[PDB]
Scaffold this active site. Structure first.
Site, short mmCIF file in Angstrom:
data_model
loop_
_atom_site.label_atom_id
_atom_site.label_comp_id
_atom_site.label_asym_id
_atom_site.label_seq_id
_atom_site.Cartn_x
_atom_site.Cartn_y
_atom_site.Cartn_z
CD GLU A 48 -3.16 -0.89 2.09
OE1 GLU A 48 -3.62 0.26 2.26
OE2 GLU A 48 -3.59 -1.86 2.71
CE1 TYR A 170 -3.22 -4.66 0.74
CE2 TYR A 170 -3.28 -3.36 -1.25
CZ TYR A 170 -3.79 -3.68 -0.03
OH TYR A 170 -4.89 -3.01 0.40
CG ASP A 211 -2.07 -7.16 3.78
OD1 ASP A 211 -2.75 -8.15 4.14
OD2 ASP A 211 -2.52 -6.00 3.81
CG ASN A 213 -5.90 -8.13 2.71
OD1 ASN A 213 -6.29 -7.66 3.78
ND2 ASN A 213 -5.43 -7.37 1.73
CG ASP A 342 -4.17 0.08 8.74
OD1 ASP A 342 -3.09 -0.02 8.11
OD2 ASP A 342 -5.29 -0.12 8.22
CL LIG Z 1 -9.98 -14.22 6.53
MG LIG Z 2 -4.89 0.73 4.31
#
Ligand SMILES: [Cl-]
Ligand SMILES: [Mg+2]
Length: 379
Positions: A48, A170, A211, A213, A342
């Site tokens: 990101e 990502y 990431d 996700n 975050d």
């Molecule tokens: Cl998940």
């Molecule tokens: Mg973000």
């Protein structure tokens, strides 16, 4: 840590310009070299970036590092992945280990490199630029759909000497929860994992980090633990929790609304599920070193709901390595006190100079003066 170990670092930075407004990075004048020296890191991926082409003159010019950055072609301020490789000095023990022989954008191989003036060639069609492993990524993948899958700046691949391939990702999150978005997320994951299996089969040693996700396990999800009424009573009681609540730990992975969790687990040789573990080929370095006992090992927290202070989050950031690299792992942890995003960073230290590990299959680009190319011989 030692000069002989490579430190891998992954960090979803929630926009690299915003990232530099957090301490201590706010004192570093937007210098990635200072950031990588702060982490003492050698191979770094950030996800990101939320950047744009004109800003690459900053983020892709890092003193003492090679920069490999993928961003959407047009959309600005969205997605983006970078991977940076430290350039060792001549007398550093890693001088040869860290040499970069190939680098590639995307997961499908269909993205292109400028070849001549009015000419571009896909990685898939140039064996001396593409890393390989393109066979049967998906039965229906044509160029148009492949380019769509690879259009959001979500993956960079770097091949080092000795056959190590670092894949920085990502993966889509389907934040809108659209049906089209869920289909895209699943197709991305499946292509990614088949590419990994292909490269493993060819003999590459893989580091897949970033990431993803996807939560691989119930113990990595604060929200589902609460939803299931499972309290964390012992902070190192992870194995007991997964035993006493094994029915819920399974339910979490095989939930029919979230098949991406089961698809993800099939690549993990340390999966909680025996069939997944038997077919898995990658090791979760953080879980290996921290063990399944460590609960609340979260790497992301919902910022809008302000849930990081209560450490109520999930773990969706990983450094995964080939089974053949497992003995190399000297350290692997998350860094939840470090600000910037975050998410928090994840790092792992590998001693890959270890002469006991099988050597990887290298394919060093052949110079164009080699006779087969210079005289256009038949293949
Ligand atoms: Cl998940
Ligand atoms: Mg973000």
């Amino acid at each position: 840590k030692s000069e002989n170990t490579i430190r891998f670092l992954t960090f979803n930075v929630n926009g690299i310009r915003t990232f530099f407004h957090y301490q201590p990075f706010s004192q570093m004048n937007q210098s990635l070299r200072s950031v990588f020296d702060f982490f003492r890191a050698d191979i770094i991926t950030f996800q990101e970036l939320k950047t744009e082409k004109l800003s690459i003159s900053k983020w892709g010019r890092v003193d003492g590092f090679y920069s490999f950055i993928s961003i959407p072609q047009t959309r600005k301020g969205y997605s983006g992945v970078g991977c940076w490789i430290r350039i060792p000095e001549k007398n550093h023990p890693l001088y040869h280990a860290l040499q970069v022989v190939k680098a590639e954008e995307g997961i499908t191989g269909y993205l292109t490199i400028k070849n001549g003036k009015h000419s571009a060639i896909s990685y898939r069609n140039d064996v001396n630029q593409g890393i390989g492993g393109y066979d049967s990524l998906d039965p229906d993948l044509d160029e148009k759909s492949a380019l769509e899958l690879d259009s959001e700046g979500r993956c960079v691949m770097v091949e080092l000497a000795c056959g190590i391939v670092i894949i920085s990702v990502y993966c889509p999150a389907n934040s809108n929860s659209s049906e089209e978005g869920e289909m895209f997320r699943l197709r991305f994951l499946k292509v990614l994992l088949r590419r990994v299996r292909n490269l493993d089969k060819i003999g590459k040693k893989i580091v897949l980090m970033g990431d993803v996700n996807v939560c691989r396990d119930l113990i990595d999800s604060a929200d589902t633990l609460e939803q299931f009424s499972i309290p964390i009573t012992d902070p190192m009681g992870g194995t007991k929790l997964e035993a006493q609540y094994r029915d819920k730990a399974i339910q979490f992975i095989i939930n029919p609304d979230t098949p991406h969790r089961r698809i993800f687990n099939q690549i993990l040789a340390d999966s909680l599920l025996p069939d997944a573990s038997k077919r898995g080929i990658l090791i979760d370095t953080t879980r290996l070193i921290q063990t399944r006992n460590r609960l609340k090992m979260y790497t992301v927290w919902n910022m809008l709901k302000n849930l990081r202070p209560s450490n109520y989050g999930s773990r969706i950031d990983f450094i995964l390595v080939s089974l053949k690299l497992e003995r190399c792992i000297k350290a692997a942890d998350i860094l939840p006190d470090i600000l910037g995003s975050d998410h928090c960073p994840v790092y792992s230290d590998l001693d890959i100079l270890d002469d006991r590990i099988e050597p990887g299959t290298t394919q060093v680009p052949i110079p164009k003066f080699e006779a087969r190319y210079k005289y256009n011989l038949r293949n």
